[PDB]
Design a protein around this ligand. Structure first.
Ligand SMILES: Cc1ncc(C[n+]2csc(CCOP(=O)(O)OP(=O)(O)O)c2C)c(N)n1
Ligand SMILES: Cc1ncc(C[n+]2csc(CCOP(=O)(O)OP(=O)(O)O)c2C)c(N)n1
Ligand SMILES: [Ca+2]
Ligand SMILES: [Ca+2]
Lengths: 807, 806
């Protein structure tokens, strides 16, 4: 549960002191100096003579354009924090402005506190400049390596979804969220503005959007800087914001005036925020118009206005570096020298190379500092969830009537379970879902909380299970749902979201970035404590999108997640819920886990339950398992074939194939896979099955029929170095399907029980069985023709029950 | 170029007649009946007695909620088209309203012209209802098997990108883009609204966005319907639209009153659009406010208000079926029967079960029909590109100075080639880039066209190569760029977009949906003529994201595109451009290709040119090739190791490693792979190398060191049944990287020349060569330490040049 830090939502009531503003100007000037330094200088940080091109980096890596803008804002936010004692986390949309984030951390004292090698003296200042975007050094973005960051801003557009996740169930948290005007052109950013109808000003914190309207992205102007100011204002008002606009640096107005104007404006907005928060103590059912700030300043603010006759300040040319080289010529190095001198470092640094005390006297102390605030390292806040007994959700009926029982909808059991997680962990757990929580069958959670909704109510006949405050949130944007949950985890809370499988792909790129964040964190950032896993229920999956058709039939998220399964990072979970009981086992493991993206593939369709809780726990701990009770073979030598399934439906088709093989008197072994990564080469993954364990399950010499939920390519590439790999005959989804019957879905993809049975015969003795094979292919066409003619499936397919079930 | 159809941008100058609105009401009623029919009925389409339980489908598949609103709008649009002669393509954002699109096709006559068994009689009606979302019948969405569809709407969000793409260079085309109020909550849709700053009312057509504000998505209200009307209007006005709102169906207003108000509003919005189009002939540097329409009607409109005491009209409950079963009880059956009778079908059908002439008399005829419009079968519009002679762009310096010459930036040649395609094919070719065209080094295009920009200008010192019309469009949104080009293609034109490799992932799901579109088309839609291919330049790739770091290091698009490579559909291309010359040869194949998505992985960094064109073309046609001139072994028995590379940089490190193995006297074959699918099993893919050709290139029995651009998993999974697949040692990107140097990038992923040379020697004799392996491992840390001390790479890495250079 988020901590109450500082003295939240306090008005100042006095003007901002001239003293504190002189601080901010110094912060600004020194942060700009540190920022140019990190880009340009390998040595001689303070320009002690002789200062020459030998001091300048060979390759210029880093972004200036965004950075002076960031430095001004952060300077002013640091003043704000100190004077008000406000719990504040910043979201740096333009994450390519990493020099501003490292500067902030250097100057607030979290950098030295975290990297003691980087000292508050000339020598520390020198390693500090060299390390930036430099071999064996630090990233060029506001990376997880930087104290203060929960958002890299590498991949643009998640600034607002991250900002609004952070404040959820975080009533003391202020989040000034800085958004690139280029970033604002992305789809994820454009929908993120609407988050203000999904948060409550009493129970959640406050996000102040700051649009960094610097006029440009890389090689273009931005749309929002070149529409009318009037359009820009209606735009933000229409999305439920009170827009304030600040314009500085397009004229000769001196720095002190700029700082005085800004500080008055900032305090006027803050006053408005303190009134929103004070009102919300009495009235949290009326949605307020939340302030947002349009920060219009020239890109590259304070760089040379022109370089080699090209406009540089207030241009896209300042995007990366305004001065392409400071080595090629003396005239160029001279521009660097002048530029660095214009911040007057002689005033900012004492002879020992430390920043003077009067630069940083206005700065916050302790856990209020941007870099030290525990919300920016949410691991330190994160508690274990109080979990209910998994026993109470177990489908007991498998133990009663045998493996293969029933027509249960597995995701309902995950719903009962998550419901009680929310009940027992209020303010600490959230379900997100893109208008799919009921569709994926997770609505049992509506018994103990509601869908959070802070737009209009109209009627009890339609507005069911909705309140201004609640642990479930739903918007039709996978981006928003991935986004909110990511930031809710980064600030030390927990959750699950669900998606139709096909549409997980919408946020493939966001899985990549959070995976990279997690990969970087577990390799080389041990100060950044572990966060709860991004748990993702993948359901309404390909084999039962027979009702929605081809658009909804893509299980390929499996393939994407496999490209983040390296270096024994163990940040990817890929689980196949065989049934309700396997789903509970996976669920508990995932909800206990940390530093992972967990993807749980589970059906919502009525389906058999195969395992007891115990059998599922067992299969899950190793990842795969022989099903002895299902196997006509007694050991691997007797076995003529290995029937292996991954996914609840493949399991179903394999078990049914197994009953037809059973009647022809074939000896076969049945294998279930629940953990895809258990099959990964034991060379690449220390948690996979050993080649010995693998060979014991898949036999080493017998052919294996593998029925796989997703695309067969996934397995053929996982097991390339595995014992017996060349005897694996892998069936998976094959881009066949439409709106049809469950049976046609498996049939047309050659993973139906009939084809599986036939395939198993072909692989034992083709000629010996030529006629039972030919009988099976004929029936395959007859059952299809039965569906075409009757509009439901042949009763052979429909009415089948595993032989192992008794009345 | 898009053809001019009908009489575009024409005002009525008259009231909509009573006759037409009577027809629109009959259209609306019959579309509703045909829609419910398609959902509910296996037989007895006209409820001839006995009409029972048994005439109802066992399983209800389809969506009612959106359908009556869609039927209403499409009814009014059909009237409009006929009255105006207006070249009109609709975008059905709520594509789950399929029955609206099927009904429309069946009613405009294109259904029976395209599918002769589905007749305009009771037998046809019976087939038409049964086939909907039924095994061996047709899809539940507005799929490509539906005449008049260029947009399925299964994956919501792309309504507006497709709308705006359709109209680029399409000045006669009007696109009513119907948007879900739920769909409007998606990221892609939210930014799609801003496209009106990137289109020009003279050189492009007009999109009319229609917010289908029926108040609900599946199980929730929509944000846009439960905020104040003032906010809703401010929002659209802020985004450069003049918002008009229509409210109907919440009260007892008679249907004719509703049609009269709507038709009046509609012609008012159409008048403004005609004014914008007339103004734009004279002035087109001043962006107008484009009308958009807020359509506020209750979800499931005209279904029973309450069923079993639950509100169904004007509720999320109407989303799928307002009536969950019509077979379970007599009373539910009566609700279906009553509902169907509420449209009074006996006034709509003749004794033969044909829709009465008086119902369809207002409809468009011929190519104006939504179903017949060539823009919805763009392949009937597509011409072959007038391509310049590929010879004129070849790096000739490989003939003169030899194989491995130069520090050329390969994308720059594609830029020149593509420039001249635009000069030769004006209004038929477009570049899209998310603010990355210059960065990907395609700026040569600016010599003949401009970035299209219809927001504001301030200064010649910043606004270079921008004009209100131009064939290059940037917006920082992959969705927008992908979406725009998808529709430019679907409406019968050509182009390419570029993206940083890592960020192609943003639009993974749009590749999926476009792939699936082309999969269904080549399999069973022979009447949908072939479209130009979706050409994607994948550059600023993982091996040269040394300057941005980990975030920008993901070449995993290859992984995604492999999951659409089946049934010999041949709709995916994955090409690695070895160099400028291989790039020119891939470009040419891709630009001539139809019905494809082509990923072209090309380096923008300065690199060696390896092949001449003639050789490049020979490698491509096969997909892979023995490099005879680079091999020290002169047959497959002689060779102790095969060195294979796919990708400009894995190639580089393989060629450099071949020099180190030459000096050791080692006998090796050098193999380059340009078509990733050439390697795919011969059983799955009939255009792959035969097992024979495969074993002949990679040898039957020798160790192969494969240096791969992307995730090794790709190549491993492709070759599982190939000759000698077990001897493949595949190296690729491994999620190692940072902000560092070119050499550190290959080093940390174990694909630098040094490691490859060591890995070659490990595969021959770990024993014989232990001494040389250890030397090469030590030189890796020594060349990393060099980079750390100095801030640039060791000259053995930096300055290296292939032995074969003069
Ligand atoms: C999703 C995505 N697409 C493309 C890029 C490439 N990119 C990185 S920075 C940038 C421009 C950023 O412009 P803006 O947000 O206006 O930033 P600022 O002016 O503050 O530097 C672009 C196109 C990206 N980082 N992420
Ligand atoms: C990208 C995407 N995410 C989720 C879904 C699942 N989905 C199908 S229809 C729908 C709701 C549709 O709401 P709206 O756009 O309001 O359509 P209408 O009410 O007109 O049916 C949802 C969430 C989808 N089809 N596509
Ligand atoms: Ca910007
Ligand atoms: Ca809707």
């Amino acid at each position: 549960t988020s901590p109450v830090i500082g003295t939240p939502w306090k008005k100042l009531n006095a003007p901002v002191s001239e003293e504190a503003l002189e601080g901010v100007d110094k912060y600004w000037r020194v942060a700009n100096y540190l920022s140019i330094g990190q880009i340009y200088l390998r040595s001689n940080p303070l320009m002690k003579e002789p200062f020459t091109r030998e001091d300048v980096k060979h390759r210029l890596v880093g972004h200036w354009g965004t950075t002076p803008g960031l430095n001004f804002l952060i300077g002013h936010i640091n003043r704000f924090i100190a004077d008000h004692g406000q719990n504040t986390v910043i979201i740096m949309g333009p994450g390519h402005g990493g020099p501003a984030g490292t500067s902030q951390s250097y100057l607030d004292g979290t950098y030295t506190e975290t990297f003691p090698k980087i000292t508050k003296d000339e020598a520390g200042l020198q390693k500090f400049f060299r390390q930036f975007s430099y071999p064996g050094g630090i990233p060029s973005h506001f990376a997880p390596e930087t104290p203060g960051s929960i958002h890299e801003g590498g991949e643009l557009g998640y600034a607002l979804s991250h900002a609004y996740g952070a404040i959820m169930d975080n009533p003391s948290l202020f989040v000034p969220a800085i958004v690139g005007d280029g970033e604002a052109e992305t789809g994820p950013l454009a929908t993120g503005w609407q988050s203000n109808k999904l948060v409550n000003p009493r129970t959640d914190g406050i996000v102040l959007p700051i649009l960094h309207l610097n006029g440009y992205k890389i090689a273009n102007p931005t749309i929002l800087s070149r529409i009318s100011d009037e359009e820009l204002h209606e735009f933000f008002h229409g999305m439920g914001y009170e827009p304030y606009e600040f314009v500085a640096g397009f004229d000769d107005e001196d720095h002190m005036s700029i700082h005085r104007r800004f500080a008055e404006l900032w305090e006027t907005i803050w006053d408005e925020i303190c009134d929103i928060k004070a009102t919300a103590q009495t009235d949290n059912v009326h949605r307020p118009f939340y302030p947002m700030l349009i920060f219009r300043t020239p890109k590259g603010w304070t760089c040379p206005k022109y370089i080699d006759g090209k406009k540089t300040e207030g241009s896209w040319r300042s995007h990366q570096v305004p001065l392409a080289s400071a080595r090629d010529t003396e005239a160029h190095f001279e521009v660097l020298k002048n530029w660095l001198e214009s911040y007057k470092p002689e005033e900012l640094f004492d002879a020992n190379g430390a920043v003077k005390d009067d630069v940083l006297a206005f700065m916050p102390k302790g856990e209020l500092r941007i870099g030290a605030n525990p919300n920016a390292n949410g691991g330190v806040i994160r508690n274990d969830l109080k979990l209910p007994n998994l026993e109470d959700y177990e489908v007991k009926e498998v133990a009663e009537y045998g493996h293969g029982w029933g027509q249960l909808e597995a995701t309902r059991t995950l719903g009962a379970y998550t419901r009680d997680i929310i009940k027992n962990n209020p303010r600490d757990f959230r379900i997100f879902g893109p208008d799919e929580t009921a569709s994926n069958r997770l609505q049992a959670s509506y018994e103990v909380t509601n869908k959070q909704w802070d737009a209009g109510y109209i009627s009890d006949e339609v507005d069911e299970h909705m309140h201004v405050s609640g642990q479930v949130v739903e918007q039709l944007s996978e981006h928003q749902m991935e986004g909110f949950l990511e930031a809710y985890l980064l600030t030390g809370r927990h959750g699950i979201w669900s998606s139709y499988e096909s549409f997980v792909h919408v946020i493939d790129s966001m899985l990549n970035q959070h995976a990279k964040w997690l990969e970087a964190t577990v390799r080389e950032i041990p100060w950044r404590k572990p966060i709860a896993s991004m748990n993702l229920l993948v359901s309404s999956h390909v084999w039962r999108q027979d009702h929605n058709g081809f658009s909804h039939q893509d299980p390929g998220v499996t393939s994407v997640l496999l490209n983040k399964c390296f270096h024994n990072d163990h940040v990817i979970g890929i689980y196949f819920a065989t049934d309700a009981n396997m789903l509970l086992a996976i669920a508990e493991k995932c909800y206990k886990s940390t530093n992972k993206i967990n993807a749980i593939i589970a059906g919502k369709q009525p389906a058999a339950t195969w395992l007891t809780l115990d059998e599922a726990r067992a299969e899950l701990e190793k990842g795969a398992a022989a099903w002895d009770w299902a196997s006509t073979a007694k050991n691997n030598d007797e076995a003529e074939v290995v029937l292996a399934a991954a996914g609840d439906v493949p399991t179903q088709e394999i078990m049914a194939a197994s009953d037809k093989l059973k009647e022809l008197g074939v000896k076969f072994k049945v294998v279930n896979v629940a953990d895809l990564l258990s099959l990964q080469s034991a060379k690449e993954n220390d948690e996979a099955l050993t080649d010995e364990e693998f060979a014991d399950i898949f036999t080493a010499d017998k052919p294996v029929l593998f029925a796989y939920h997703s695309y067969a390519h996934d397995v053929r590439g996982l097991i390339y170095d595995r014992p017996n790999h060349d005897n694996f005959n892998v069936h998976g989804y094959e881009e066949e399907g439409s709106t049809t019957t469950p049976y046609d879905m498996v049939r047309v993809n050659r993973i139906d029980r009939y084809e599986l049975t036939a395939e198993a015969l072909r692989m034992i003795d083709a000629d010996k069985y030529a006629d039972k094979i030919d009988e099976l292919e004929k029936f395959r066409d007859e059952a299809f023709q039965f569906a075409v003619d009757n509009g439901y499936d042949h009763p052979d397919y429909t009415d089948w029950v595993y032989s192992g079930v008794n009345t």
